[PDB]
Write a protein that binds this ligand. Structure first.
Ligand SMILES: CC(=N)N1CC[C@H](S[C@H]2C[C@H]([C@H](C(=O)O)[C@@H](C)O)N=C2C(=O)O)C1
Ligand SMILES: CC(=N)N1CC[C@H](S[C@H]2C[C@H]([C@H](C(=O)O)[C@@H](C)O)N=C2C(=O)O)C1
Ligand SMILES: CC(=N)N1CC[C@H](S[C@H]2C[C@H]([C@H](C(=O)O)[C@@H](C)O)N=C2C(=O)O)C1
Ligand SMILES: CC(=N)N1CC[C@H](S[C@H]2C[C@H]([C@H](C(=O)O)[C@@H](C)O)N=C2C(=O)O)C1
Ligand code: NA
Ligand code: NA
Ligand code: NA
Ligand code: NA
Ligand SMILES: [Zn+2]
Ligand SMILES: [Zn+2]
Ligand SMILES: [Zn+2]
Ligand SMILES: [Zn+2]
Ligand SMILES: [Zn+2]
Ligand SMILES: [Zn+2]
Ligand SMILES: [Zn+2]
Ligand SMILES: [Zn+2]
Lengths: 266, 266, 266, 266
């Protein structure tokens, strides 16, 4: 006779958990996460910003890389998120306890973050993480300014209701670099058509493809670097093959159209 | 020499606080609020639904009218909201403590409700009320079904980010009546253009006018009855002069266009 | 070279996950959990009360047993908790989404429940579960009355800050039965002396031993049945060997004294 | 005929709202509130701590006084509270939005703060303020250390369940000064005996009198300065007449005993 199943941990490919040293993207922007999960540190004269933290177990590694960059826990002022799933917002709660950082997010992302990713529209309770509270709610197109760097939120609902692209302008070799940290556009295992928990899912994804295509985008980065053709382990050529935002959006739309057709057939 | 000002209470016209007896809208739908604030009771064989409660001080009156209708506190199963301002969601926290009711709302409305209307995009802390938690987060177009009555959410952001129209089909004289409880479309004292806390405000209002115009709408009701030309004190002719959703949307858009022009001149 | 560890799921002995049929404790009280985790259903003419739910994956089983007892989801009115760890409050969030149930708990238990057991004073983030909100905060000695059954809270801090014993009087064979659902008194792996996250831990445990010893207690039950010598699989003799509250408290204090001495030596 | 009453604002004596310039208590501790409400700034080489903020409308004044003291918004690291009523925690939410400050509080105070003082055990919804979230939950006797100043929490439940005394050691004229910021011990309009929302109220107050009497206490301060015989407008003699903690506790107990006798007679 038969017990209920044990809880199953959210396990991921080893490369998603492989620590890397900070990799410079532009004068003040660094990848400080793992080989296969993005966590961006932007350093200003008035404190640092973190965009995503990856998986829950990455908090100490992130703090190590911040220290290596000259950023103490008191100096981390702000955490921004692409979206509030365990593999991108995992360590936010612990980061808030261990640093000065406050979280800014849209209402959708704040609600999901506050329930630790539980009751996910598509994953249920299978992919949860420690809950965290947002300190500031942001609206579409709202700006947040830290030490003179202006971050603009561009909502791009689909992968989660609260999915957001964050854009800012850094410098490199003396010239401006418009960085676009565009969120995921995948729909892994999702029911796309007639989903009662997300009735306008398709319309939202389509609008989001268009939003991504039009972002100010000298350099695209994505929460999973492979989605934008980054290779964080490739050193001086890590970003050489990166997609434009236009190409990223088009590829995501072609994949989505294929998934729709397969869902209709399945 | 000069102390800081006393706190100022949110005071309203007396008619907004004038109790009225239940007024039947359709076979299972009743206005149970005050003369000038809507609070709709929908009674099903499987419990009752309340859409809005008006001002914070209306909780006991609402429970009295429920009792008059045969609805005990245990029988109130669900509270839905047009939007989470003090004059419409005021008594929600107290209602939850005193009844079996659970709150369903979109993420925007849930976030504002949970802070008691504080840090409002336009009103600051001037119009607050007891905070309440939502039990279920709803997405645009999602349905909720109670005792066979199907409520559909139609987001219509503008007056608040989370503004929602709720629609359902009741019966009257044997025939179906498609009821549309459309939210407010006013922008009282709002900065419309270039608002840093709401950058896409104008676009959102315009989309919301179009949403309202197209709602299934044999009968329109609104949180302030005067917005839809209801007169709750007029008895058997309370709804005789009611606007169509098309006319409500058009009138709101003409007012909004005038406010835009005046803001440009002011 | 070496990735960060995978997240580790909270795994438990199979007997803790072994479903059992409802086992009657008294005229209106039933064990409806698993062989080795208590979940008590108290059925009244005015709805049902659940005290604990066990592990997160037990929600559907609990609802099955409620249905077997004549309790539909609408009829579950109240969830009470011994303490807010994953193996006792695990399924609370899901139960709230799927039933009419509202949660009453003390402030300590409410705070831990709302963070899904994360940032535990002793376990860190190793034993988390879906977060849930409390609907009512209870004070020490406060009563809650459902369908004529009066539940009294007795705080007994130690195993968690919010640990609570719940007492009520049922009937059996015509006579009153004072049931005491006393919380855990273990300190598994805890640093007892000089704990910076719990400076008065020892004093609290000692007061809690005394609280437990003095409870009205014709029948003791505990979250882990083995702690009170229940054997839920033993049928008509499941409770034959149960400890008195006095014996439970004394045994827990002797164990605690031994742990203190071993900690001083270790 | 008769509308429901207008909401009534929480109004206070003018002196409670009368701004004052910073008044030095010890080398690093300043009163920065109003004439009749305490708000303590402790300045360290590693940022500043605020203990209480007074009424909701005091936020800007507090920030002005911080600026006068050399404390920018980024430099405010921590807010601690005596208890979470509107006249002491009023501006906490706004302070968090406008500074780097994080809130540490016990579970009881955190729960009341998060509901903006609504559903108060004694005041109902009559004395509410903007809700705020705590960033860290503290246990009885726990320490928090900022820039080398060690703050110790001493729970003293009664006026609110979460009432706390905060103690720390500053210096003055070269010598250590043990400062005790003891919470209120009043019970304004409270039902003391047999209160169903607070069954152990009397026992808690009695234990709290004893806690206060034994605090390390070279200098006592209280949320209402008059309770400890401070006169913030008296300049160089503001603290000359201050009570010892022993005298404060004894006076509060004599008042409480009188209130008990009057309640028995009333
Ligand atoms: C080839 C490539 N570049 N890939 C493939 C996997 C992810 S795609 C998707 C799935 C993943 C996550 C998971 O499967 O563990 C679930 C929980 O979302 N994250 C997702 C996201 O797009 O953010 C990136
Ligand atoms: C003529 C007519 N039918 N009217 C005029 C006032 C309201 S219009 C607007 C203003 C009101 C509220 C207030 O002024 O107290 C603020 C806080 O929103 N509610 C609003 C809403 O549209 O919901 C309805
Ligand atoms: C022999 C007997 N009757 N036992 C032994 C294990 C539990 S004792 C303790 C440990 C357990 C839980 C765990 O180890 O998984 C942690 C998270 O608390 N629950 C605990 C509690 O007392 O509630 C009951
Ligand atoms: C003579 C003297 N020193 N006094 C007299 C009033 C306050 S005593 C009590 C009442 C007050 C507050 C109010 O009445 O507005 C309620 C909401 O608590 N604060 C209270 C506290 O002890 O904190 C201090
Ligand atoms: Na905000
Ligand atoms: Na939900
Ligand atoms: Na409560
Ligand atoms: Na904490
Ligand atoms: Zn994701
Ligand atoms: Zn992902
Ligand atoms: Zn409004
Ligand atoms: Zn209104
Ligand atoms: Zn436990
Ligand atoms: Zn346990
Ligand atoms: Zn007070
Ligand atoms: Zn006070």
């Amino acid at each position: 006779e038969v017990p209920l199943p044990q809880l199953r941990a959210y396990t991921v490919d080893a490369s998603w958990l492989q620590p890397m040293a900070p990799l410079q993207i532009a004068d003040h922007t660094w990848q400080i996460g793992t080989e296969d999960l993005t966590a961006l540190l932007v350093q200003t004269p008035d404190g640092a910003v973190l965009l995503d933290g990856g998986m829950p177990q990455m908090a100490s590694h992130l703090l190590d890389n911040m220290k290596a960059r000259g950023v103490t826990p008191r100096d981390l002022r702000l955490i921004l998120l692409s979206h509030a799933h365990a593999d991108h917002a995992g360590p936010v709660a612990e980061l808030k306890r261990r640093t000065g950082a406050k979280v800014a997010a849209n209402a959708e992302s704040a609600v999901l973050l506050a329930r630790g990713g539980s009751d996910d529209l598509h994953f249920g309770d299978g992919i949860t993480y420690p809950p965290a509270n947002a300190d500031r709610i942001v609206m579409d197109g709202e700006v947040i300014t830290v030490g003179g760097i202006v971050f603009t939120a561009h909502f791009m609902a689909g992968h989660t209701p609260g999915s957001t692209a964050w854009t800012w302008t850094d410098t490199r070799n003396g010239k401006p670099v418009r960085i676009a940290y565009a969120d995921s556009l995948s729909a892994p295992g999702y029911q796309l058509q007639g989903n009662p928990r997300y009735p306008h899912l398709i319309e939202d994804y389509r609008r989001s493809f268009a939003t991504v295509r039009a972002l100010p985008c000298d350099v695209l980065l994505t929460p999973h670097p492979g989605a934008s053709n980054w290779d964080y382990a490739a050193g001086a050529r890590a970003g050489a093959k990166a997609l434009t935002c236009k190409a990223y959006a088009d590829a995501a739309e072609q994949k989505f159209d294929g998934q729709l057709a397969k869902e209709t057939a399945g």
